[PDB]
Motif scaffolding. Structure first.
Motif, short mmCIF file in Angstrom:
data_model
loop_
_atom_site.label_atom_id
_atom_site.label_comp_id
_atom_site.label_asym_id
_atom_site.label_seq_id
_atom_site.Cartn_x
_atom_site.Cartn_y
_atom_site.Cartn_z
N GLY A 5 37.34 35.32 31.28
CA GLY A 5 38.33 34.24 31.56
C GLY A 5 39.64 34.81 32.12
N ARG A 6 40.08 35.96 31.60
CA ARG A 6 41.24 36.66 32.19
C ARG A 6 40.99 37.15 33.62
NH1 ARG A 6 43.15 40.23 26.97
NH2 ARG A 6 44.13 38.54 25.79
N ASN A 7 39.78 37.62 33.93
CA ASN A 7 39.40 37.88 35.33
C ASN A 7 39.53 36.66 36.25
OD1 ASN A 7 38.07 39.60 37.46
ND2 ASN A 7 36.54 37.98 37.36
N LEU A 8 39.21 35.49 35.72
CA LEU A 8 39.35 34.27 36.50
C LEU A 8 40.79 33.75 36.44
CD1 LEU A 8 35.90 32.66 35.71
CD2 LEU A 8 36.82 32.86 38.02
N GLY A 9 41.60 34.30 35.56
CA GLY A 9 42.96 33.81 35.37
C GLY A 9 42.95 32.40 34.79
N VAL A 10 41.99 32.12 33.90
CA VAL A 10 41.97 30.83 33.21
C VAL A 10 42.27 31.09 31.76
CG1 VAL A 10 40.66 28.81 32.53
CG2 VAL A 10 40.20 29.89 34.74
N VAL A 11 43.09 30.25 31.16
CA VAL A 11 43.37 30.35 29.75
C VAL A 11 42.28 29.53 29.08
CG1 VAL A 11 45.01 29.80 27.91
CG2 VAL A 11 45.87 30.58 30.15
N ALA A 12 41.62 30.10 28.07
CA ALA A 12 40.55 29.40 27.38
C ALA A 12 41.15 28.37 26.40
CB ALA A 12 39.66 30.39 26.65
N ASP A 13 40.52 27.19 26.32
CA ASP A 13 40.94 26.11 25.41
C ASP A 13 40.33 26.34 24.01
OD1 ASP A 13 41.59 23.72 24.01
OD2 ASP A 13 41.11 22.43 25.73
N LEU A 14 40.97 27.23 23.26
CA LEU A 14 40.51 27.62 21.93
C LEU A 14 40.64 26.53 20.87
CD1 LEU A 14 41.87 31.27 21.98
CD2 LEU A 14 39.53 30.50 22.54
N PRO A 15 41.75 25.74 20.87
CA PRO A 15 41.83 24.56 20.00
C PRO A 15 40.67 23.60 20.12
CG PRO A 15 43.69 24.71 21.57
CD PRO A 15 43.06 26.05 21.46
N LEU A 16 40.32 23.23 21.34
CA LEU A 16 39.21 22.32 21.51
C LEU A 16 37.92 22.93 20.93
CD1 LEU A 16 38.10 19.64 22.60
CD2 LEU A 16 37.47 20.93 24.66
N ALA A 17 37.66 24.19 21.26
CA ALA A 17 36.50 24.90 20.71
C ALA A 17 36.47 24.95 19.19
CB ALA A 17 36.41 26.30 21.28
N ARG A 18 37.62 25.23 18.59
CA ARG A 18 37.71 25.19 17.12
C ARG A 18 37.36 23.81 16.60
NH1 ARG A 18 42.55 28.15 18.38
NH2 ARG A 18 42.04 30.39 18.14
N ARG A 19 37.68 22.78 17.37
CA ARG A 19 37.41 21.42 16.95
C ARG A 19 35.92 21.09 17.01
NH1 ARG A 19 41.82 20.26 19.27
NH2 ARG A 19 41.00 19.14 21.09
N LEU A 20 35.28 21.44 18.12
CA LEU A 20 33.85 21.17 18.30
C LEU A 20 32.97 21.95 17.34
CD1 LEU A 20 34.53 19.33 20.53
CD2 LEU A 20 33.61 21.01 22.15
N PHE A 21 33.43 23.13 16.93
CA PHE A 21 32.66 23.98 16.02
C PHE A 21 32.79 23.67 14.52
CE2 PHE A 21 31.52 27.31 19.18
CZ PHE A 21 30.19 27.40 18.81
N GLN A 22 33.68 22.74 14.16
CA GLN A 22 34.04 22.57 12.75
C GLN A 22 32.92 22.03 11.88
OE1 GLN A 22 38.95 22.30 12.79
NE2 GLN A 22 37.70 20.51 13.37
N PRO A 23 32.17 21.02 12.35
CA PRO A 23 31.00 20.54 11.58
C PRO A 23 29.94 21.61 11.30
CG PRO A 23 31.55 18.98 13.28
CD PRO A 23 32.40 20.18 13.54
N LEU A 24 29.59 22.39 12.31
CA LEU A 24 28.59 23.43 12.13
C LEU A 24 29.11 24.55 11.20
CD1 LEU A 24 25.77 24.28 12.82
CD2 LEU A 24 26.70 25.66 14.71
N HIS A 25 30.38 24.92 11.35
CA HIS A 25 30.93 26.00 10.54
C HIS A 25 31.06 25.61 9.05
CE1 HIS A 25 32.67 29.68 9.41
NE2 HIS A 25 33.94 29.34 9.50
N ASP A 26 31.44 24.35 8.80
CA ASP A 26 31.48 23.75 7.45
C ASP A 26 30.15 23.76 6.77
OD1 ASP A 26 34.13 23.06 7.68
OD2 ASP A 26 33.72 20.93 8.10
N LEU A 27 29.14 23.31 7.51
CA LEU A 27 27.78 23.35 7.01
C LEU A 27 27.39 24.76 6.59
CD1 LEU A 27 25.20 21.78 6.55
CD2 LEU A 27 24.54 22.45 8.88
N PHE A 28 27.82 25.75 7.37
CA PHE A 28 27.54 27.12 7.04
C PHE A 28 28.34 27.54 5.79
CE2 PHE A 28 26.03 31.30 8.33
CZ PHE A 28 26.84 32.11 7.55
N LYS A 29 29.62 27.17 5.75
CA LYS A 29 30.49 27.47 4.61
C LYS A 29 30.03 26.84 3.30
CE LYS A 29 35.15 27.94 5.98
NZ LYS A 29 35.79 26.84 5.22
#
Ligand SMILES: [Fe+3]
Ligand SMILES: [Fe+3]
Length: 220
Positions: free
Chosen positions: A62-86
């Motif tokens: 992503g730094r090679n492309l000069g794009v900032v990754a949307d980490l908040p959104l990703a944290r949001r989409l992953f929360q159900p699966l990560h909870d299930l694991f937790k």
């Protein structure tokens, strides 16, 4: 595909975000598993460190492309699966934790990277192919362990699969539009996941017929 276009770079920020967080979470998952499978603690910790390296590799893409990754959104989409694991971790459910990270997440990663590879930019392509070579080691661990215990765990596996597969399907639906904008067919990516994940369930001990059934259930 124009890597400089608005549509590509916006969709890329979000897919790269999911990748970065997912690899991050895979690290966390293997460390949680290591501290509940003492016999293979060293091995699991190395696998986790592998995930760390995957994450920083994709940070660089992503730094090679000069794009900032949307980490908040990703944290949001992953929360159900990560909870299930937790939740499974919290009850000492090492079997179900292994199916989630070791089979489901790993097979999604492989399917995604398979479909990204032929549309990836020249920096990202080598890295992506190398990351793909690592994930079989992750799959084999989970498949071996689960195979050895197949008899005690089979019912628990079928059940965690039923719980987990819907969460990853919701993530995919959310991301399908962005995947298209970076040249991945989300339909064909899902198909590849299905083929891989059936191979994995087979490899554990499920009958080919049972593998398909357990998936189709989760589809419907
Ligand atoms: Fe990885
Ligand atoms: Fe992995």
């Amino acid at each position: 595909l124009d890597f400089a276009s608005a549509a590509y770079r916006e969709a890329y920020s979000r897919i790269n975000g999911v990748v970065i967080v997912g690899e991050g979470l895979a690290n966390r998952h293997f460390q949680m598993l290591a501290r509940r499978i003492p016999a293979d603690r060293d091995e699991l910790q190395r696998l986790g460190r592998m995930e760390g390296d995957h994450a920083s590799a994709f940070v660089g893409c992503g730094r090679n492309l000069g794009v900032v990754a949307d980490l908040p959104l990703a944290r949001r989409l992953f929360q159900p699966l990560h909870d299930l694991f937790k939740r499974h971790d919290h009850d000492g459910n090492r079997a179900e934790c292994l199916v989630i990270q070791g089979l489901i997440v790993e097979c999604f990663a492989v399917a995604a990277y398979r479909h990204y590879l032929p549309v990836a930019d020249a920096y990202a392509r080598p890295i992506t192919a190398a990351v793909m070579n690592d994930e079989s080691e992750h799959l084999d661990y989970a498949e071996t362990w689960l195979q050895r215990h197949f008899d005690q765990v089979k019912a628990r596996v079928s059940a965690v699969v039923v719980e987990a597969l819907p969460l990853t399907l919701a993530m995919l639906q959310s991301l399908a539009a962005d995947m298209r904008q970076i040249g991945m067919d989300p339909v064909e990516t899902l198909a590849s996941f299905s083929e891989l994940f059936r191979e994995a369930l087979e490899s554990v001990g499920f009958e080919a017929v049972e593998a398909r059934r357990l998936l189709m259930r989760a589809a419907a």
